[PDB]
């Protein structure tokens, strides 16, 4: 439970068009959690210093999902819908470097820490965060601001260290009315490890054993299907170095000549989509990223979710 938020912030219903749907070399679907943990850090270096606050955690709640896919004739797999790119200066068609896209309706429980809570009102913070977050892009996709027939959904804020124990189930059961048509994505790292010593029949690794939880696999009649622990998905769970760290000028194709570089690989894990009524406290639902730069581990998870 590192850096417990003194305030939760609910960016209520963000509508996103053309988000990246590939998300890893192995997975596809809902985009990576590192996109969200980078989005909250891009908020943090635009309004977080001007308000002296700290946006550090993020809760991912997907309300609506739609992918540009199509199922071919005579196959049970999917293929991705594409865009026609511009031509070359030769007049010929360029290569088809395929990309997956998805529409996306999301909610973001942010978590605020600093001393700027105690200087500004709770309504000043929420507008300066919301109207900033309509200038940015989430997963390569445009955050589309509100216009409709209904009313724009407002950006609330709790102060979850404030109140009695009756307010600690009056407040955290008031936001859950605004998160309930969708599902929350949490990190399940203990399941994939306790399913690894569960396999005593074979002695596998975590690669073939995360592939054995994605399955609606069918067991022989002693037919039947093996039991469901929930709605489990594979997620990208960070990065891992495959190179030593380079000095910040000794590659001349970097994004900048002031930051060190590593060549990294992906690092795959397990997650679960669950209704937010199973959630005891909504601060346990937040995504952080910790790094071990002495190792090569750059990863993200939801800690404090038992």
């Amino acid at each position: 439970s590192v850096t417990d938020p003194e305030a939760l912030l609910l960016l209520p219903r963000l509508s996103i068009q053309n988000a990246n749907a590939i998300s890893s070399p192995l997975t596809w679907g809902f985009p990576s959690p590192g996109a969200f943990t980078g989005f909250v850090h891009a908020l943090q270096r635009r309004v977080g210093i001007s308000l002296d606050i700290e946006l550090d955690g993020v809760g991912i709640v997907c309300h609506r999902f739609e992918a540009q896919i199509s199922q071919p004739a005579g196959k049970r797999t999917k293929v991705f819908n594409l865009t026609r790119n511009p031509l070359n200066r030769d007049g010929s068609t360029a290569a088809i470097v395929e990309e997956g896209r998805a529409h996306l309706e999301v909610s973001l429980l942010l978590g605020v820490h600093g001393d700027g809570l105690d200087d500004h009102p709770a309504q000043e913070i929420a507008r300066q965060v919301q109207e900033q977050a309509g200038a940015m892009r989430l997963a390569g996709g445009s955050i589309l601001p509100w216009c409709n027939e209904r009313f724009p959904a407002p950006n609330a804020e709790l102060l979850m260290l404030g109140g009695s124990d009756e307010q600690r189930r009056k407040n955290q059961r008031r936001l859950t009315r605004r998160l309930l048509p969708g599902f929350a994505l949490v990190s399940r790292e203990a399941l994939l490890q306790q399913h690894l010593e569960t396999l005593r029949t074979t002695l596998p690794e975590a690669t073939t054993l995360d592939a054995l939880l994605d399955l609606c696999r069918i067991n022989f009649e002693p037919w039947q299907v093996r039991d469901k622990p929930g709605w489990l998905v594979p997620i990208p769970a960070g990065y891992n170095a495959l190179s030593p760290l380079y000095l910040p000028g000794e590659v001349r194709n970097a994004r900048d000549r002031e930051t060190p570089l590593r060549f990294v690989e992906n690092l795959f894990g397990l997650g679960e989509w669950l209704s937010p009524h199973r959630v005891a406290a909504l601060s346990d639902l937040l995504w952080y990223h910790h790094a071990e730069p002495d190792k090569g581990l750059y990863r993200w998870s939801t800690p404090r979710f038992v």
């Binding site: 309509g134 200038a135 589309l144 601001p145 216009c147 970097a254 994004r255 900048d256 000549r257």
Partner: protein, 52 residues
């Protein structure tokens, strides 16, 4: 068969901060890039691009 009118709606957002790159290696190139973008903007507005 009873409708004669097509309605097409979309939402545009005009962001701004135009000449700032989202990626650049050289600090010298960004420094003499945003100065050239400013001496475009300060000498004449976006009004010629904005009308079109």
């Amino acid at each position: 068969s009873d409708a004669d009118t097509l309605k097409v709606r979309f939402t545009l957002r005009v962001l701004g901060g135009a000449g700032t790159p989202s990626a650049c290696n050289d600090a010298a190139y960004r420094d003499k890039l945003l100065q050239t973008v400013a001496t475009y903007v300060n000498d004449q507005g976006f009004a010629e691009l904005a009308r079109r």
